[PDB]
Design an enzyme around this catalytic site. Structure first.
Site, PDB file in Angstrom:
ATOM      1  NE  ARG A   1      -1.677   2.116   3.434  1.00  0.00           N
ATOM      2  CZ  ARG A   1      -1.566   1.820   4.726  1.00  0.00           C
ATOM      3  NH1 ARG A   1      -2.295   0.836   5.248  1.00  0.00           N
ATOM      4  NH2 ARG A   1      -0.738   2.522   5.497  1.00  0.00           N
ATOM      5  CB  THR A   2       3.259   2.745   2.405  1.00  0.00           C
ATOM      6  OG1 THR A   2       4.674   2.877   2.233  1.00  0.00           O
ATOM      7  CG2 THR A   2       2.959   1.559   3.275  1.00  0.00           C
TER       8      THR A   2
ATOM      9  CE  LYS B   1      23.324 -13.557   9.305  1.00  0.00           C
ATOM     10  NZ  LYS B   1      24.743 -13.840   8.938  1.00  0.00           N
TER      11      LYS B   1
ATOM     12  NE  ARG C   1       7.673   0.345   6.092  1.00  0.00           N
ATOM     13  CZ  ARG C   1       6.667  -0.507   5.959  1.00  0.00           C
ATOM     14  NH1 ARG C   1       6.824  -1.572   5.196  1.00  0.00           N
ATOM     15  NH2 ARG C   1       5.508  -0.293   6.561  1.00  0.00           N
TER      16      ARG C   1
ATOM     17  CG  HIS D   1       5.508   5.295   8.056  1.00  0.00           C
ATOM     18  ND1 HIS D   1       5.913   5.793   6.840  1.00  0.00           N
ATOM     19  CD2 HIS D   1       4.637   4.292   7.784  1.00  0.00           C
ATOM     20  CE1 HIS D   1       5.312   5.124   5.866  1.00  0.00           C
ATOM     21  NE2 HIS D   1       4.536   4.210   6.415  1.00  0.00           N
TER      22      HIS D   1
HETATM   23  N1  LIG Z   1       1.033  -2.302   6.253  1.00  0.00           N
HETATM   24  C1  LIG Z   1       2.078  -3.034   5.460  1.00  0.00           C
HETATM   25  C2  LIG Z   1       2.334  -2.357   4.097  1.00  0.00           C
HETATM   26  N2  LIG Z   1       1.110  -2.349   3.230  1.00  0.00           N
HETATM   27  O1  LIG Z   1       1.112  -2.985   2.109  1.00  0.00           O
HETATM   28  N3  LIG Z   1       0.145  -1.679   3.726  1.00  0.00           N
HETATM   29  O2  LIG Z   1      -0.959  -1.696   2.917  1.00  0.00           O
HETATM   30  C3  LIG Z   1       3.402  -3.007   6.292  1.00  0.00           C
HETATM   31  O3  LIG Z   1       3.463  -2.222   7.234  1.00  0.00           O
HETATM   32  O4  LIG Z   1       4.320  -3.809   5.930  1.00  0.00           O
END
Ligand SMILES: N[C@@H](CN(O)N=O)C(=O)O
Ligand SMILES: N[C@@H](CN(O)N=O)C(=O)O
Ligand SMILES: N[C@@H](CN(O)N=O)C(=O)O
Ligand SMILES: N[C@@H](CN(O)N=O)C(=O)O
Ligand SMILES: [Zn+2]
Lengths: 310, 153, 310, 310, 310
Positions: free
Chosen positions: D54-55, D84, D105, D134
């Site tokens: 999503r993000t 690793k 991320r 975030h």
């Molecule tokens: N909430 C998910 C990311 N995502 O796709 N949210 O829709 C995460 O924190 O990994």
């Protein structure tokens, strides 16, 4: 026959003080004088729907030490059980036609009790059902305390760690509360304190208990130091570190401990008891583990052999 | 023949009748206890005039009786509901729903990891009355909740 | 010694009526009078190249009930077998130097027969080789029918479900066709009907068989109602639903059934027989499963012990 | 030119009041008048070391709406990831030579700040680093509140759910505390209450706050109802359900709500907001998510384009 | 402006004859004269909930050839997918606020139609939903037949393979049945024959059709030979091979074929068309696949651009 003959062993709560005494009595006896042929022509099912090697090896070893035959599995994707919608009920209805007893370990809380309703005449011994009951673990703990303290009444018991989720200590606290004059010391971070329902029970039986922030705070009075596992996945990584503080035991902390104190631990201890403790005379977690054989042997003997041991 | 009328709205005869059921609780009992699985006649009335100031449900099911460990089962849903046996008032004690020691087959354990959900067993909860609350302990997982929890989910 | 002594048990077709009679006779005997030490100093290999818990637990339980020792595995990525290009042949050539008998279950159709050519003197019992043969399953079925009907001839047998792929019913149909006067009733959706080669065989032996769309259509005549598993992966999800229709059994369907009828099922029944049936006197699938112990015990006794049982 | 040109956007705390205003002002301007070619010849890296669909899609859409190009990976175990072995430092030192900006991320706290020390004049925008920061999530939250309430001061803010681990509410609380006269209402199970360090901050600034057990205690005065996700794993199943009570929202609860109130949620609302809420005029979580494009377009615009837009 | 502007493209059945003509006409025009900037400032979501590399790359290439930007995921188990929690509805309600169009592939039937009720004026194009619809696949098929045969009426169409489960042939048959005087030849193993509901439709419209066992029975009159993929799993290995016969195509079989015939295939032709066919002038499956760009460019053009192209 004996009071536990052909009885399902599902919850510690269903066990009366009499029952506990009988199991512990038998355990001591088999420990003193082994009976390798007691359950010779018996076949036992070791059904670990949820894997747990140590508990499984302890249980099966007990079966062999009594001469019984063993068949079973570890459903951790090692078998072909309940693929689509095959119920536990049907599994038990099947297996209960093969064996003389079912030892099961399952991820869901009332598994063993359910098994009981579909196993007609075949006894089921709960080796752990989710966050609910683990009868034999408690029995081996009580046996260890009795053997090292010479009694189960009028003792000073300290329980450290995750007292909120450790259902091991909930069961042990309740078991000991069936005996008189015991005093409890609860050491745990606020976010993992002993549950109120347990304290409520102790109050209504007029049993003494107090909360403490550190082990050293009562190290001088304790007869039994029960160390519990603190799972990382529980709190926040930073949270843990900030609290692990001293809910960790080190040899240094035992300077003023009673000569008779024993340090116990459900076992996976990596993150709670420093190895330097292993050398002290107080370390009794491996011995504790060793006692699982006698408590579990005693239980099997009792439900599968009519007369008492000897 | 001795029965005497053609009443499709409010009658009587050898049958049990539950009285003063709170609104929206009458149909609930019909479902939860499958009271319509009968072959015997049934006459129900809902949202009708109450004790001069409210609303209530009414259930009349002919040719069938209720027992002690059954009427009680109405305790958790229809507390102040009366149950007049009506073979013709052959009722004895002040028949009012008391709290049963156990409630089976109707409740659903709030515990998602409870074995009772995906299995062919009947739900079963032990009952304990609390101050401002009621504790129900699952026969299977042995977890205890308040009826407020068990009735919502 | 007995006719099956040291004989490989691979296909039901290789078994003569005489053989079936002898196996079933032995099964009844061991059931009546267990012999826990019959195979005392024998070691049996339980080789499940393809996992199958129930069949494996039934088989191994049988081995123990006779006193034999057991070693084996479940190649479902639990072992280190045939990594690159290591043949089944070599595996057998090795294992056959360790044990007194090999019980194997494999995903490929002629596995057990192949094993036979590399096991020199060591008997191999097929526990299932792909879509081909499953000897012991058929033997336990026949035993159940015989025990509940008192015979294997002149019966009314109904087989419901996936008759096209259920090799369980192909083997059972052929087994029963070695006995006289049996009448068959085949109930299955058109897309999963009994194969023509099976009907051809019944015709050439002059055996009576008829097709039906519903169980209720013949419920009144049937002595044995064999319910089969209908795998979802077979047809289309919508296809299934549209046909599952009544190839599903419910207690209600047994209103006019013969007092002696028994409902059988290879076992995983979740999607074919409603639990309300479990209470009726006709439900015999768990008993059927329980009989797997005697049929499989009988087979092992016969191939590993020279003289007949008693 | 602008204050945020070429700056790293790592922690909401490194953002001054004016920065927040600038970002929010820019976001509104781009929302009213799009500039599809503003970042025309720029190439941006979308590095999701930790998958977050999503993000990620929100961030990438923002990039395309400004005309920039995108390269990247959601190395959620599907990239020739440094086995690793290769350090994050080395990964960044390489990537910072290919692109004009890095949006990342990561599972570990501090990742984005560490990247900052290895990137070369190449700005790094933190898309989330473990349980730390975030930035853009707080920005879209702030932007959504400002748009719906017309301001960010003198508001009544209720935060429901997991206040202990929901770091998005920690950040949002600290951001709103940079504005005057705000009033907070904290509604959460005691085991997941707001951390004391947050309350300390509010007391330090004289900000008014209070604890409540249910939403219906404050529904009347709330301008913003921020719903948090509560992951059952944070507690045990029996615990979760027990507290679940009302900490979930449903239409009936909004009977006395203020006309201007908006219900917000980071998402994954599966277990907190009943769908019968979606239709009310108060539901604004999907609009909230839609504002992510504007707040994140704004950051990219500010850091990569010297002169203000509109 | 145009009939399909801003419309959802979910089922080939919602498409009228004129719609098909419009799409096909547009496809030909874009093929003759590309318009690389037609969708310049548009941002499209490529959401493959179910991985499908070929059709995904085909769809995405179409987007880029019109100048549009693309965001998306082949969440084939590699995205922070709603942990079986977040509904498809919520996913769409969020995504529909980011982009201008949604192209989605999903495992469940009805997915695209459901998305339609949660998207906001944002058009949804079905890239395939379980065993239901694949609109653009039928369009490229239709487009390829029209281009090679000069028309879609009065043709002789043979369909070989799995006609029972190959939903692409179900759709193509129903689409060609919207044209006059077409003649059909169905060649398939009896266990995978055309569904009766399809034949019912053809009889309802007086369309001529017939069943054949081999391709060489009709090779002489065929204008279009549509080869279907037959997945062995649909049958058992021994069954597949047994029928395999001639339902596979090889060069020698085209000796008497019409000069204008084209052999088509959805792909995954591994087991149906021998490579010695690729060289003949009849092979047109790779050209067929290449026409996907045009038919799908055409749909995107029509739904997102008011005025017709060329
Ligand atoms: N909430 C998910 C990311 N995502 O796709 N949210 O829709 C995460 O924190 O990994
Ligand atoms: N019983 C433990 C594993 N363990 O330590 N077994 O010895 C578990 O299942 O969590
Ligand atoms: N034998 C079955 C699994 N099962 O039910 N075993 O009891 C199989 O391999 O398909
Ligand atoms: N045929 C695949 C998609 N793909 O990549 N085709 O080339 C599917 O249906 O999932
Ligand atoms: Zn429960």
């Amino acid at each position: 026959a004996n009071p536990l003959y052909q009885k399902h062993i599902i919850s510690i709560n269903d066990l009366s003080r009499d029952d506990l005494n009988l199991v512990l009595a038998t355990a001591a006896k088999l420990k003193a004088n082994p009976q390798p042929e007691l359950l010779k022509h018996k076949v036992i099912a070791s059904c670990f729907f949820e894997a747990s090697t140590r508990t499984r090896l302890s249980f099966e070893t007990s079966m062999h030490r009594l001469g019984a035959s063993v068949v079973g599995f570890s459903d951790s994707a090692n078998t072909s059980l309940g693929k689509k919608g095959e119920t536990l009920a049907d599994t038990i209805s099947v297996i209960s036609t093969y064996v003389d007893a079912i030892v099961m370990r399952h991820p869901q809380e009332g598994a063993a009790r359910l098994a009981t309703e579909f196993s007609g005449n075949v006894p089921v011994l709960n080796a752990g059902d989710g966050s609910n009951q683990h009868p034999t673990q408690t029995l081996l703990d009580l046996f260890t305390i009795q053997e090292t303290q010479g009694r189960l009444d009028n003792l000073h018991v300290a329980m450290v760690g995750d007292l909120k989720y450790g259902r091991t200590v909930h069961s042990l606290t309740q078991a000991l509360a069936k005996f008189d004059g015991n005093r409890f010391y609860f050491i745990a971070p606020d976010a993992l304190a002993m549950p109120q329902y347990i304290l409520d029970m102790l109050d209504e039986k007029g049993i003494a208990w107090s909360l403490h922030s550190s082990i050293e705070e009562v190290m001088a009075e304790v007869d039994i130091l029960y160390m519990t596992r603190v799972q990382k996945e529980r709190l926040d990584p930073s949270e843990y570190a900030n609290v692990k503080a001293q809910f960790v035991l080190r040899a240094s902390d035992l300077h003023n401990a009673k000569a008779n104190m024993k340090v116990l631990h459900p076992l996976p201890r990596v993150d709670e008891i420093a190895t330097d403790v292993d050398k002290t005379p107080h370390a009794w977690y491996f011995q504790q583990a060793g006692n699982g054989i006698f408590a579990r042997q005693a239980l099997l003997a009792l439900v599968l052999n009519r007369d008492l041991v000897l | 023949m001795t029965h005497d009328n053609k009443l499709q709205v409010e009658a009587i005869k050898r049958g049990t009748v539950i009285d003063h059921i709170p609104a929206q609780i009458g149909f609930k009992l019909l479902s939860l206890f499958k009271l319509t699985e009968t072959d015997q006649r049934i006459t129900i009335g809902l949202n009708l005039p109450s004790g001069e100031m409210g609303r209530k449900d009414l259930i009349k099911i002919e040719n069938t009786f209720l027992s002690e460990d059954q009427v009680d089962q109405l305790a958790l849903y229809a507390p102040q509901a009366t149950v007049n046996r009506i073979d013709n008032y052959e009722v004895v004690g002040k028949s009012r729903p008391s709290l049963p020691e156990r409630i089976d087959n109707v409740l659903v354990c709030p515990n998602s990891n409870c074995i009772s959900h995906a299995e062919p067993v009947s739900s079963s909860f032990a009952v304990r009355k609390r101050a401002n609350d009621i504790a129900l302990k699952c026969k299977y997982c042995e977890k205890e909740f308040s009826h407020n929890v068990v009735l919502a989910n």
